[PDB]
Amino acid sequence: PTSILDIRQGPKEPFRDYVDRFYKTLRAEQASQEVKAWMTETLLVQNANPDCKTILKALGPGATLEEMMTACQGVGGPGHKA
């Protein structure tokens, strides 16, 4: 049994992959909807990797998920075969 607290972005993991894992685990978490909102508002940025965390903090709390994805595109990457 996993916990949302256990979900952290990998050192080179694409932000898009991490958000998907965060979402899947949060859906299964046993907590109120109000708490799930708070977990998303705080833990998603807090448990991002250092390079994405910097970017997300700069964007600020008004940013949309789509905007966060665009800002973190290619961080850790670009993940093409050599």
Partner: peptide, 12 residues
Amino acid sequence: ITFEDLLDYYGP
């Protein structure tokens, strides 16, 4: 962002 934002993004 909120949990509802994740639901919208990956859902309905």
